[PDB]
Every structure is written in C-alpha cells, then in structure tokens.
Amino acid sequence: RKGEELFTGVVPILIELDGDVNGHKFFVRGEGEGDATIGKLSLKFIATTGKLPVPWPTLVTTLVQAFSRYPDHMKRHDFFKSAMPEGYVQERTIYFKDDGTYKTRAEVKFEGDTLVNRIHLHGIDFKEDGNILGHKLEYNFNSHKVYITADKQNNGIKANFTIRHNVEDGSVQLADHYQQNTPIGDGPVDLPDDHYLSTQTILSKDLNEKRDHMVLLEYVTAAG
Amino acid sequence: MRKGEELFTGVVPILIELDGDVNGHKFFVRGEGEGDATIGKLSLKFIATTGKLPVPWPTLVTTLVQAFSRYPDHMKRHDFFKSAMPEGYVQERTIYFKDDGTYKTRAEVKFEGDTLVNRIHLHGIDFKEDGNILGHKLEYNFNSHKVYITADKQNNGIKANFTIRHNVEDGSVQLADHYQQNTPIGDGPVDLPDDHYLSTQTILSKDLNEKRDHMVLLEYVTAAG
Ligand SMILES: [Cu+2]
Numbered sequence: 001r002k003g004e005e006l007f008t009g010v011v012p013i014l015i016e017l018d019g020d021v022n023g024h025k026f027f028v029r030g031e032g033e034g035d036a037t038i039g040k041l042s043l044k045f046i047a048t049t050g051k052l053p054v055p056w057p058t059l060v061t062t063l064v065q066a067f068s069r070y071p072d073h074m075k076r077h078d079f080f081k082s083a084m085p086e087g088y089v090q091e092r093t094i095y096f097k098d099d100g101t102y103k104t105r106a107e108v109k110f111e112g113d114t115l116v117n118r119i120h121l122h123g124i125d126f127k128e129d130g131n132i133l134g135h136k137l138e139y140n141f142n143s144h145k146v147y148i149t150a151d152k153q154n155n156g157i158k159a160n161f162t163i164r165h166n167v168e169d170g171s172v173q174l175a176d177h178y179q180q181n182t183p184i185g186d187g188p189v190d191l192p193d194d195h196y197l198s199t200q201t202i203l204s205k206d207l208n209e210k211r212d213h214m215v216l217l218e219y220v221t222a223a224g
Numbered sequence: 225m226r227k228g229e230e231l232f233t234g235v236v237p238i239l240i241e242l243d244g245d246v247n248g249h250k251f252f253v254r255g256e257g258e259g260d261a262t263i264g265k266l267s268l269k270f271i272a273t274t275g276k277l278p279v280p281w282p283t284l285v286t287t288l289v290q291a292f293s294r295y296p297d298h299m300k301r302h303d304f305f306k307s308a309m310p311e312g313y314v315q316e317r318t319i320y321f322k323d324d325g326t327y328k329t330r331a332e333v334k335f336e337g338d339t340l341v342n343r344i345h346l347h348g349i350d351f352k353e354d355g356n357i358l359g360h361k362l363e364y365n366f367n368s369h370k371v372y373i374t375a376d377k378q379n380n381g382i383k384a385n386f387t388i389r390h391n392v393e394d395g396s397v398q399l400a401d402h403y404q405q406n407t408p409i410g411d412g413p414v415d416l417p418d419d420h421y422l423s424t425q426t427i428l429s430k431d432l433n434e435k436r437d438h439m440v441l442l443e444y445v446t447a448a449g
Contacts (some may be wrong), residue, residue, distance in 0.1 A: 025330075076335075
C-alpha cells in the first residue's frame with residue numbers, strides 16, 4: 001500500500017523522543033492510533049526517565065502530520081502521506097518568546113504496520129526561572145493554523161506557525177515554529193500549492209497512571 | 225551477581241554504538257568485537273552505517289571502554305571503571321581540536337547481558353570547512369598517549385585529562401585536548417583511585433573484504449604509576 005493508501009483506516013502509532021534541554025536529558029515514548037479520514041489522533045505518552053524538566057505542552061508539536069484530514073479536493077496537496085511508507089524527515093526551529101530555543105529532527109515513516117516518529121530534540125539558552133524550566137505553563141493546548149508551502153529544490157515543503165501557550169498567570173507564551181520536511185526515499189512526492197492545517201488539541205491525564213505522562217487528543221484538517 | 229572485575233576475567237564481547245552530529249552532518253557508527261582486560265587488549269571493527277563519515281575515523285577513536293585497561297596487581301584498587309560494573313558509568317567529554325571545532329560526548333558504558341556496551345551521543349561544533357577534520361587531512365593511524373586519571377570524591381567518580389596527537393598529512397600534528405568526567409550509574413560502592421595514568425597504544429587498519437566505510441581497531445592499554 002503506498003501514499004494515501006496506508007491511511008484508509010486506523011493506524012497504530014509509535015513516537016519516541018530523545019531530548020536534551022540546557023543539559024537536562026529525558027526520553028518520552030508515545031503510543032496510540034491515528035485516523036486520517038477524520039484527521040484524528042489518540043495518544044498516550046510516558047516520560048520514561050522520570051519527571052520532565054520541561055512542560056508537556058512544549059513537546060506537543062514535536063511529538064505526525066500525515067494524519068491530517070485532507071479533503072478530497074485537496075488530496076493532490078498531501079505531501080505527508082505521499083512520502084509514505086519510506087517517509088520524511090521533519091526539522092524545526094522553535095523560538096520561545098523571551099526564552100530558549102528548541103531544535104528538532106525527526107524521521108516519520110512506516111515500520112511494518114506502525115507509523116513511527118523518532119525524534120531528537122535540543123533545547124538551548126533557556127532561563128532557569130522562565131516559564132519553561134520554571135514549569136509555569138498550563139496543562140492544556142490551543143487551536144492554531146499551520147501554513148504550508150512547497151520547497152521544490154529540496155523536493156519537500158516548508159511550514160511556519162506560532163503556538164500560543166497559556167501561562168498560569170493568564171499571560172500567553174508564544175512559540176514561533178519554522179519547519180522543513182524532506183522525503184527519505186527518492187521517491188516521487190506531492191508538492192503542494194500553498195495551504196494551511198487547522199489544529200485543535202486536548203491534553204488530559206490517565207487516572208490510573210503514576211508515571212509522568214500526557215494523554216493527547218487531536219483533530220487537524222487541511223484547508224485553503 | 226557477576227560484578228566488578230569478576231566480569232572481566234575472560235574475553236568479553238563488546239557492542240559500541242555512536243550517534244553523531246558534526247556541524248549538522250549526521251552519522252551513525254556501530255562497532256563489535258572483544259576485549260581482554262587481563263592483558264589490556266581490544267579488538268574491534270566499526271562500520272559507518274550511514275555511509276562515508278563527515279569526519280576522519282581517528283577523531284572518533286577515543287569516543288568509540290576503559291574498563292578493559294589492564295590494571296596490574298598493585299593497581300587493582302584504583303580501577304574505578306571495573307568496580308562500577310555491571311551497572312556501569314556515564315562517560316562525558318569535551319574535546320577541543322586546536323584551531324578547530326569541538327566534540328561534546330556523553331556515553332553510557334555498562335553490561336547488557338553478557339555484552340559490554342558503549343552507547344554514545346556526540347555533538348561537534350564550530351569546525352572549519354577547510355580544516356583538518358572536515359577537510360579529511362588526518363592520517364589513518366594513531367599514536368601513543370598518557371591518560372591522566374584523578375578521583376572525583378564529591379561525585380563518587382573520576383576526572384581525566386590528556387592530549388591526543390593526530391598525524392596530519394603534511395607532516396604536522398593536530399592536537400586534541402580531552403577533558404573527561406565519569407560518574408557511576410548505579411548506587412553501589414565504587415573504587416575511587418589515586419592519581420595515576422593509562423598508557424595507550426592503538427593500531428588502525430582495514431578489512432580488505434569490507435566495502436562499507438569502516439575501521440578495524442587494535443588497542444593495548446595499561447594502567448600505571
Ligand atoms: Cu544531540
């Protein structure tokens with residue numbers, strides 16, 4: 001099955017993130033399912049190394065855009081699915097306003113029946129008493145627009161957006177995302193006209209779970 | 225139950241895995257082979273699974289298992305490395321290549337079943353594009369060095385310092401200053417050594433049957449002094 005064919009039903013997901021922020025090292029594993037026909041994810045993440053040194057919401061965008069719902073008239077613009085099963089590399093720079101920066105590199109691809117997202121994350125120049133290392137971010141998420149454009153030279157796409165993180169004092173912590181994706185195989189892909197992804201996400205907990213963790217529900221639809 | 229030196233009485237299988245990123249160039253190296261700490265000997269083969277390395281093989285040598293150093297009878301009480309096993313230790317370094325970039329490394333060295341494993345993550349920053357490393361101007365060989373070890377009583381570990389001498393193709397020598405710190409992974413007691421050193425000698429060769437970018441390594445190390 002190739003491209004969009006791999007997403008004609010519920011697909012199991014494995015996510016693994018190795019992170020290092022200001023020298024603080026942690027690992028997160030996530031598992032669950034995605035249904036691209038309706039643009040839906042259901043995931044549970046565990047911090048296997050103990051309590052995270054950063055707030056869970058700062059990791060959400062790093063922790064599978066192939067599961068976005070692309071309506072039929074837009075299927076010709078679905079770079080993410082078109083790269084499957086071989087997959088794509090996803091890199092970002094994330095600038096937390098008045099604070100540090102995340103640099104991330106990931107491979108998103110099928111390993112057998114499972115869609116896997118393996119990530120390496122760096123965090124630099126974070127303030128010890130800032131919102132991130134100070135854990136002042138609310139455990140929730142907001143709704144965003146992800147702008148996507150083609151990158152013909154690299155046979156891929158670029159994306160940019162700003163995440164809004166609610167701070168415990170009512171303020172909002174912005175995080176500017178700059179994104180590049182490039183196919184792993186060689187490996188023809190869909191190169192899209194400009195469009196966007198509309199995102200909505202809920203962060204919850206598992207009442208039976210004692211480990212530091214995050215339950216995530218996400219709905220994303222392509223438009224424009 | 226097999227613990228400390230006891231786990232080095234014979235020839236031990238070794239697995240080494242290095243994930244590297246130098247000036248944005250990414251690579252992965254796996255090595256397999258054997259070590260015999262009674263005579264201080266390593267015999268190892270490394271493969272670059274990601275293709276041609278962006279840096280010379282000799283620059284990775286020190287990163288790619290000091291528990292296999294031969295500690296003579298009078299020195300056994302200074303052997304921090306073996307005493308930490310099987311749970312193992314974290315080994316961290318900063319390596320400054322003079323007039324060039326820097327390696328930052330963090331590794332876990334420990335037993336996994338019967339195998340001694342060395343798992344490493346490496347960052348390289350500020351390297352010059354036309355320098356000895358990114359320019360691949362280093363000879364495929366190695367020299368003999370002295371690794372100075374000192375105890376770190378506060379952290380229940382050890383610190384080390386030394387300078388590697390890398391032969392350059394033009395007859396010059398590229399120095400690489402190593403700064404090293406090791407801390408036990410487990411909560412058991414360990415040996416904290418007096419000041420001493422390790423005397424190192426290493427040969428780099430090739431496997432005439434091997435098509436992949438690779439390095440065969442032969443190493444002898446003895447503690448002294
Ligand atoms: Cu890294």
